[PDB]
Amino acid sequence: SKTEDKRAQKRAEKKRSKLIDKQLQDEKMGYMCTHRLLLLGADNSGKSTIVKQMRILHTSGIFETKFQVDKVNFHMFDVGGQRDERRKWIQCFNDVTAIIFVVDSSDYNRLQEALNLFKSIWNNRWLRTISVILFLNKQDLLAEKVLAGKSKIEDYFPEFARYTTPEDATPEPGEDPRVTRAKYFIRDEFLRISTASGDGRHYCYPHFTCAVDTENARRIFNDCRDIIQRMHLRQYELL
Amino acid sequence: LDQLRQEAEQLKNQIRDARKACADATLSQITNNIDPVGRIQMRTRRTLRGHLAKIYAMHWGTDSRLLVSASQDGKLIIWDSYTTNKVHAIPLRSSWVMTCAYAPSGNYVACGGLDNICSIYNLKTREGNVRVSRELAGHTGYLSCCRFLDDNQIVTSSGDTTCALWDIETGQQTTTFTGHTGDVMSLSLAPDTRLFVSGACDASAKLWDVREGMCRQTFTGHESDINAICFFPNGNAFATGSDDATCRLFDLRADQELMTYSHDNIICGITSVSFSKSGRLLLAGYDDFNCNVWDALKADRAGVLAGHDNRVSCLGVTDDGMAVATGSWDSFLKIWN
Amino acid sequence: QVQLQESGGGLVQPGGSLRLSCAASGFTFSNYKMNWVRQAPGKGLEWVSDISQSGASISYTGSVKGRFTISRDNAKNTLYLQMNSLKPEDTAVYYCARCPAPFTRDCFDVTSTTYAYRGQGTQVTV
Amino acid sequence: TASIAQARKLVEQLKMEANIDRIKVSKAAADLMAYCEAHAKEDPLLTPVPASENPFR
Amino acid sequence: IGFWCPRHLKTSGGQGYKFLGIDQCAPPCPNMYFKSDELEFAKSFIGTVSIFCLCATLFTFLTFLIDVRRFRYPERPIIYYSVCYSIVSLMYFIGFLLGDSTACNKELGDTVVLGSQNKACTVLFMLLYFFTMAGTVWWVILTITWFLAAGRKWSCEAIEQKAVWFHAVAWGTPGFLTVMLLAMNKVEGDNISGVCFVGLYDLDASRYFVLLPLCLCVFVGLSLLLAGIISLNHVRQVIQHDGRNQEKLKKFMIRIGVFSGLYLVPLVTLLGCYVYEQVNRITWEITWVSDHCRQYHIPCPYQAKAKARPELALFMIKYLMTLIVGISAVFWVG
Structure with a gap:
């Protein structure tokens, strides 16, 4: 009787293990199809103004954003319930496929510490594979700020005087060349460290946006498609 | 405020002078008449598959049979280490977790992470299905290591530079331990359940008592953040692993740093430190996709355990000291003997 | 214990070049890289400069470019900040900090007065 | 740093200095040696065990 | 009158095969198309081919024992394909070493085996035909895995758990069609090499059972x-x-x-050989009966205005080419 009972409970344990393994394999397909995003930025960077019509669907440690584009679900994190030190919980985000790094291009100090944070994220050992989708928020505020004339770009960056607008740069219609020069100077200031330590593996996707633009989801979709295609090409030892 | 600086300096050099006076002889020359530990490298007896994301934490419990594994997918999987069969696969509210605990009894399991909340579940319930038992909240930082001492009160280490001891039934905080200035990343309990030690990002391990909220002792001697901590099986010594590629064995009674395990070919950080049952072998997980076992007497590299594709995250030894479980970021648990 | 004693600065006449010194004990100075951070009254912590392990890679902020210099000697295990003249907008307290990983090039050394591996600092005014 | 923070630090230092209870390093090392040699026979990692004896074969 | 059965070509039982609409008629045991030393030369030739082909595929026969991993689901079918044609070439070599004496159905009473009245065609025939079809279907599995891994990019490391599904097709589709050939007695014996293979001395075979499945497998493989x-x-x-x-x-x-291309157009030439040997045999027999009705004392066909003869070079390239589709994987491990 005891042997029969022990065989029965062994069979029941095996059946339960098979059932939960089947459940895990079923959840695996749903897990590895929705792309995860980690969003970083300052308090004044415009953290929640990226996506507005999917901002409200109808805890405070992590704020979540579910939004679906072209039958692909995007699962967006922002971490604000912790302290200022971030060298320990940023290792929890190794497997995230994209870091949406939002930069306030109006208030400056601020841009220098954002640049240093970008250096720290890019050169991190456990974030050395993650691509960064870089958003240049508050472009309109920069547009009137650089035409105001009260704030000089040269004071906070001495290298702006010996800079010119790139020929590959395509200026938007309806603006003077100097705001385009300022925007692409900020973009080149980020790209000089974006393209200095990364020997392949990961590159950046600079984009310009404001509080009015409602096409950021399309840009994130295209960037994630490029990221997954590049990861697939790299994993097949295709240099 | 020059008198405060003078008092701090005089107390610091008094501590240094007392430590030097009590350091009559180093223990490196003490362990000279004993035989060296042979090459006792072990092989992977079983490998546990099933996790879909990286494994961060792990625990054993009193019986050396039921593993707990926490993954960033949002899964707490309880494994039968003998026959390799999963028993429960608890889903979690917050996917980002960094700690898990198994009670001395088999009834309760715990977890926590970036949600700043410690969630505990029953296992042996009347209905037969796992569910959220209790939700301990009140930390304003991420949880790094929670450890059970009984079935009614728990001790948790958080990134808010403060540790806490909670009671389960009322859900409140019994005691709060403050005095660290950096993120507390590890927490180990003494076998007698009277003292514990917490290692922080201050290159400091502070030893606390559970009955009082005061700090019993403080230990310095590292250069970077402490990631792991573990008492000796005796209970009068402990080992700390840090990011400076050095392990450091301290003793409780002398308040002195005793032994520095380091090598010139290692630069990677140390993520998980666990003792053996006899306290001779010291198992330390490193960031070079490997683990190293040393001895606590000659401070020599006894052996190397390899076979992980990503960084190690958790390392554990059973209470009877038979199996050693290593959980790294390639979603695999390796059992060694 | 790892500590970073600081000296120099304070009542400095303009037009003279001074050398703010940081003496490090504890950690081996060669294996790590170091930063200079400043805090103005009414303002938060602001990163000023950084120097790598070998001293080849030196970086500054925009407001100090071309005037301040930073250097270090590993044999003496000391670090120096050479300052020429002064600025009217540099009245601040200066900290010399170290990011807590030896063989990396990424650091997180700006906090709300909560960081560990940071000296007491010297206050300089004009 | 802050005056209150330094006051808390110094009162903590004098509180931990109030109860010294410090011993010699040599006797602590001897106690460590004694505990290591007393439980050396029962350790299942330093000494390999037969496959029939342990359930981790 | 028309074509009538020769007296020396009468079978010993009801095998169920109709030879030009006449029951109990069988082709002779000798091939009698390679006179004098030629067949032996052919034998020697194909012998070298065997000692060539194995000596290629052994290079991809030992490539699996080096490591189990680093063979992705797209690369899963290639090792089975290589090993399958390796043992096809090996068993072709040992069938060559067996000899042509115990191949046909043993004064001029010698004739080839027609059906399940055999003694040694059984296991040889299943092994050869089933394994050749299995190798072709395994290449088709390689193509569909390539399409699933590069047309949709599924996982390349986790779709391997579906392999045991495709095995049930890859080992099952030939296994479905390898039974009928021996079921209603449509198995014949080759006398040039010493082989018992289907489709040599009949028109129904190599029309719906050998040529068409092979052609559709190649078509779907090329398309995907x-x-x-x-x-x-x-x-x-x-x-x-x-x-x-x-x-x-x-x-x-x-x-x-x-x-x-190292496998595709080779087997396209193999289908060309099959088509040429199929469209010409039906009148090759008429040419033979016209040429040798005086020797056989059977009625001569009245209008044999087109004389035809099989050529040496086409059979040489065929007996070379059949076991050349197995060396393609040798280029992959090169």
């Missing part, structure tokens, strides 16, 4: 490999639209194309 190349070329057409340059993509396309 072209689809995979088109998909990867679209992926590359995404490239060069920005400030980047890629050169490994050319190397991978060239390597996939040469690996495809």
